[PDB]
Design a protein around this ligand. Structure first.
Ligand SMILES: NC(=O)c1ccc[n+]([C@@H]2O[C@H](COP(=O)([O-])OP(=O)(O)OC[C@H]3O[C@@H](n4cnc5c(N)ncnc54)[C@H](O)[C@@H]3O)[C@@H](O)[C@H]2O)c1
Ligand SMILES: NC(=O)c1ccc[n+]([C@@H]2O[C@H](COP(=O)([O-])OP(=O)(O)OC[C@H]3O[C@@H](n4cnc5c(N)ncnc54)[C@H](O)[C@@H]3O)[C@@H](O)[C@H]2O)c1
Ligand SMILES: O=CN(C1CCCC1)C1CCC1
Ligand SMILES: O=CN(C1CCCC1)C1CCC1
Ligand SMILES: [Zn+2]
Ligand SMILES: [Zn+2]
Ligand SMILES: [Zn+2]
Ligand SMILES: [Zn+2]
Lengths: 374, 374
């Protein structure tokens, strides 16, 4: 069998920054108390993974990235009770310990057990389960899904519908939920409102989805890559504009187009200039601007407090404000009920081994979501 | 009588920055179409008035400041229908034209007819009604109340209960409403929550009032002036702390005493450092921080967007989010029904001529609100 013993398998290891992933053989130690070992089936490529590669988002190296996945439970550790061998699961990039001041808070989701605030690169108990040639490998967001097998904490995995198309539902682990929820939960987009979405990757496009589902009258998609416009309009964008086409700042362009500014703006890129423009594009007296994109480490904005004093609301969120373990299975249950489709987001599918090609596709601007099959 | 003719009276004119006000004779032109001439009875001294004097809040000079007042209608111009001569009224520092996108949005109050965004120092028709020594004098926030008589736009004045104690209710024209609403309307403080209020002037203390009325469990008042602590506790503060007493930054001090941070932060001072500390002291995963204080002109904050990405909401508002013309009379109606007291906020009462003393009182930290009687 496999249960109880160290598994030898392949995973995409990142030894140095700005380097290609190296699929090597890694040793995956068995699950400990309240931990779960999962056999990865599908994993999507998110901009956040690329941020680590570029050194934009700091995390301890060497490390095994990936966090937008789905697989089957191989073994359960001592005391696990929510999932069992053979169950279909989605590992949670943000856990739900249930005992947190935040977890007990019906309005928030950023559990204290997260490894995002002060990245250690381990499991919640302070240790690693990965080894590549006698050297320990760090975990990423507590789930490290760019591996054929991974051990995560029990509160960091949710059991989903067994009839789930894992190659599709994996996007619910980050991309879709983050995008959709930012519009629905965080911003609370009102019917008949006007929205602005900067960034048309998988997360940004899911935000347009959330805006349409919320009944937005107008949904202006913004991106320097025009090839994304078709997918944008398909998913709900009333209009698409490219900043490169105008002589004046995009915020002014947008304000001119919407009688002073949009009701809800979203930044789904991860840049300071677009974050500012996004805040500046919502109406100064009633606009709400949500930060979705992850900005480069240790880079600060230069903001005027007056921009808020007039009546603006500026907020941010992780995973669309969704409590992970509790909502993820619910989102999957809504997918199975044809509430929303994930197909338009998936443009490419390659085998796990072609991971580096998947990142090349992202940089090319040709893909939205590329799913890696194990 | 006076109706239809130019009135000669005294007003506090500010010819130059950083100088004492100068009581002089001023010619007040009669009200034009949809304008109202008010005889001032009482006017409070707000920190915003002081900001103009300090050059911290830019506005055209020379100018007649004052905006927290109450008076009686002397005359109405052509077409006025909301108020008649003899009516007790509170002039609105921010108007409610009722015809703009913002006035039409029941969620906002920053009417486009405001003179705050791009201060012109005139009435809505782009002109002045003030002349002092053959030189025109600018208006302030369209109301200029540091004058025995003033002409304002019709949408910038509200008829209030004729049985109102004008020496008390003037505070509803800015100070109280702004502080109280910031807590109740803007922040939307929840029963059983923990709040932090930076700044204990009239506005700050009214915020504590709003937090208590909202059912907050803990209300931590913060100020470098300990003499304000008694009033703070009297109005609802569960505890008062002075930053000067700790070795570590106040935001860390507050987090340590609130399990990671308060649910709602309020900055009611007008400084970049305190606005940053305030944002930093609310919990990163569920905290809301409201900017109430007016920051110094042309000064920007250096902030990391990650502070919001984890789950924080950062907002601002003017006049506590209250639609002026509509809510002012109702707030007075509530005062008359003993819903709230304004007495604790009023610490000094001087005749209009002692205006400079009133500002000296603000600087000394001995006063909260000083009311000037005409
Ligand atoms: N808060 C969260 O929970 C959360 C979750 C997932 C992702 N993210 C962050 O969201 C951001 C992007 O998500 P993604 O996975 O869809 O990435 P992506 O790379 O596929 O999308 C980037 C999009 O932005 C566009 N873009 C880049 N520069 C632009 C510019 N200057 N102006 C306009 N458009 C520009 C690109 O053309 C592309 O359409 C990253 O910061 C990612 O880390 C945050
Ligand atoms: N947004 C609005 O609609 C609105 C309305 C009215 C006033 N305001 C602004 O709100 C702010 C306060 O108004 P106010 O009339 O109550 O002023 P105030 O002068 O009476 O209050 C300032 C308070 O802050 C305290 N303070 C100063 N420096 C401090 C520090 N470093 N740390 C802690 N406390 C400090 C002072 O001791 C005093 O208690 C001003 O910026 C005013 O312009 C805004
Ligand atoms: O890319 C995915 N995530 C990023 C990591 C840093 C900010 C959000 C998610 C949210 C769950 C982890
Ligand atoms: O001082 C009073 N106000 C200031 C002007 C600029 C910001 C708020 C009020 C709110 C109504 C006018
Ligand atoms: Zn992601
Ligand atoms: Zn938790
Ligand atoms: Zn004021
Ligand atoms: Zn208006």
């Amino acid at each position: 069998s496999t249960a109880g013993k160290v598994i030898k398998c392949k995973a995409a290891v990142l030894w140095e920054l700005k380097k290609p992933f190296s699929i090597e053989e890694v040793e995956v130690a068995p699950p400990k108390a309240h931990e779960v070992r999962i056999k990865m089936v599908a994993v999507g490529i998110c901009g956040t993974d690329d941020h680590v590669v570029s050194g934009t988002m700091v995390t301890p190296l060497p490390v095994i990235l990936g966090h937008e996945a789905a697989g089957i439970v191989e073994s359960v550790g001592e005391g696990v009770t929510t999932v069992k061998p053979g169950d279909k699961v989605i590992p949670l990039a943000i856990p739900q310990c249930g005992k947190c001041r935040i977890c007990k808070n019906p309005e928030s989701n950023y559990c204290l057990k997260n490894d995002v605030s002060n990245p250690q690169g381990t499991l919640q108990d302070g240790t690693s389960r990965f080894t590549c040639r006698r050297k320990p490998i760090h975990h990423f967001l507590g789930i490290s899904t760019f591996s054929q097998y991974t051990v995560v904490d029990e509160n960091a995995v949710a059991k989903i519908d067994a009839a789930s198309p894992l190659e599709k539902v994996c996007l619910i682990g980050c991309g879709f939920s983050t995008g959709y929820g930012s519009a629905v939960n965080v911003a609370k987009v009102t019917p008949g409102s006007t929205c602005a979405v900067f960034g048309l990757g998988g997360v940004g496009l899911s935000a347009i989805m959330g805006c349409k589902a919320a009944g937005a009258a107008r949904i202006i998609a913004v991106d320097i890559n025009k090839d994304k416009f078709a997918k944008a309009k398909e998913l709900g964008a009333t209009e698409c504009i490219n900043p490169q086409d105008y002589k004046k700042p995009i915020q002014e362009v947008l304000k001119e187009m919407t009688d002073g500014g949009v009701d809800f703006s979203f930044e789904v890129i991860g840049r300071l200039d677009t974050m500012m423009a996004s805040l500046l594009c919502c109406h100064e007296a009633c606009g709400t601007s949500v930060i979705v994109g992850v900005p480069p480490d240790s880079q600060n904005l230069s903001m005027n407090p007056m921009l808020l004093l007039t009546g603006r609301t500026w907020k941010g969120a992780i995973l669309g404000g969704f409590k992970s373990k509790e909502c993820v299975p619910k989102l999957v249950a809504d997918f199975m009920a044809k509430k929303f489709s994930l197909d338009a987001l998936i443009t490419h599918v390659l085998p796990f081994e072609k991971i580096n090609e998947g990142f090349d596709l992202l940089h090319s601007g040709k893909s939205i979501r590329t799913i890696l099959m194990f």
